[PDB]
Design goal:
Chain B: Keywords: Adaptive immunity, Cell membrane, Disulfide bond, Endoplasmic reticulum, Glycoprotein, Host-virus interaction, Immunity, Innate immunity, Membrane, MHC I, Phosphoprotein, Signal, Transmembrane, Transmembrane helix. The structure holds 3 protein chains of 3 kinds. Chain B is α+β, with helices and mostly antiparallel strands. Chain B contains 5 helices and 17 strands. Chain B has 2 domains: about 180 residues, 2-Layer Sandwich (Murine Class I Major Histocompatibility Complex, H2-DB, Chain A, domain 1); about 100 residues, Sandwich (Immunoglobulin-like). The chains are: A little secondary structure, B alpha+beta, C mainly beta. Chains in contact: A-B, B-C.
Chain lengths: ~10, ~280, ~100
């Protein structure tokens, strides 16, 4: 199951 | 035995040839089970293993949404890194990300991972503590500062210790027929005279799963680590792997060399020699 | 800074003349990801060739498997021809049923 969290550099 | 789950992601920009191509694949050990490709006919996350096909429509929609959102964040991040590295907008660049978890035979977390690379070089990595960062340079330190401010490591640790380990455990159970079967290597030694005074002994390992294996040559019981030619482990296409290890030996001394094979499908390491 | 592909050409199963098999060309350890791979039969490009989905190793280098179904014979020569930004000319690796 993938991680749903979104993070940008 | 022990197991791993990994998600791999690659975005490749191509200025003047449209938007970046995004491909992500998911693995349990050396078995591919899911794939998403932005340039496919109808990009959706697709099953690649029978044991994942039982997952319902809600699973496939959730995964597809996450893939599409990651393709978008990668496009934004490719633009960011051009600024952080003072680069022209004209060249092609690559962004890679890997994350996942390793579990032991009891299903407990052995290690969690989350790491990024730009143009094939380390950019930023979550450390083994799941609490601190390794930034490769002053550009990645800018991301480190933003991620420290936003408590990103804490969000990743929660996923890695939680959903990652539990869903890995679920897949191992649903795919127990294949994921929990180790196929031992089929082994043999070939002999190739090179000259009147030397010959190559090549130790072969075929049809094994998972890919992890150790092939070593000993001469009179001593490891020949610096004199052994070791090819990269390679996929056969039927889920199994192949590998060989070779030594150049003086003609007539062949019986002094023994090949030693270590693999999780073997109860005891094997020893073999050229059986002429 | 780029990494040139490692190339291995081999069969799925030990080769037996007249017995159906798969011819593989495994390209690995390369960066950037774009690469051109052809499988050749007697120096000419084979048309039905499939490939795996782009993935990468712990050190970020990429790998792909190119493959085709084939029935080996004593006479037919097989090879893999690879082009990459690190190569000034295509690299041809012959299939040797002992490698």
């Amino acid at each position: 199951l993938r991680n749903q969290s979104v993070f940008n550099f | 035995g022990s197991h791993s789950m990994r998600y791999f992601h690659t975005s490749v920009s191509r200025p003047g040839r449209g938007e970046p191509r995004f491909i992500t694949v998911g693995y349990v050990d050396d078995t591919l089970f899911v794939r998403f490709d932005s340039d496919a006919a109808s990009p959706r996350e697709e099953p690649r293993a029978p044991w994942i096909e039982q997952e319902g429509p809600e699973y496939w929609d959730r995964e597809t949404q996450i893939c599409k959102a990651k393709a978008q964040t990668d496009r934004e991040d490719l633009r960011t890194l051009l600024r952080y590295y003072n680069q022209s907008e004209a060249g092609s660049h690559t962004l890679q990300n890997m994350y996942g978890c390793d579990v032991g035979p009891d299903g407990r977390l052995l290690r969690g991972y989350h790491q990024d690379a730009y143009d094939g070089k380390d950019y930023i990595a979550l450390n083994e503590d799941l609490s601190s960062w390794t930034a490769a340079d002053t550009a990645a330190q800018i991301t480190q500062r933003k991620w420290e401010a936003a408590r990103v490591a804490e969000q990743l640790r929660a996923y890695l210790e939680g959903e990652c380990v539990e869903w890995l455990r679920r897949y191992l159970e649903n795919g127990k027929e294949t994921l929990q079967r180790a196929d031992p290597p089929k082994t043999h030694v070939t002999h190739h005279p090179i000259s009147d005074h030397e010959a190559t002994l090549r130790c072969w390992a075929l049809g094994f799963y998972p890919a992890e294996i150790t092939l070593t040559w000993q001469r009179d019981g001593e490891d020949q680590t610096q004199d052994t030619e070791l090819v990269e482990t390679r996929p056969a296409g039927d889920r199994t792997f192949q590998k060989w290890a070779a030594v150049v030996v003086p003609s007539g001394e062949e019986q002094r060399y023994t090949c030693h094979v270590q693999h999780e499908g073997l109860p005891k390491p094997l020893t073999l020699r050229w059986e002429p | 800074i780029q990494r040139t592909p490692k190339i291995q050409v081999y069969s799925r199963h030990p080769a037996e003349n007249g017995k159906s098999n798969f011819l593989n060309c495994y390209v690995s350890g390369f960066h950037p990801s774009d690469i051109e791979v052809d499988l050749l039969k007697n120096g000419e490009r084979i048309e039905k060739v499939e490939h795996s989905d782009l993935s990468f190793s712990k050190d970020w280098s990429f790998y792909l498997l190119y493959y085709t179904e084939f029935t080996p014979t004593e006479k037919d020569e097989y090879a893999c021809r690879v082009n990459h930004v690190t190569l000034s000319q295509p690299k041809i690796v012959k299939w040797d049923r002992d490698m």
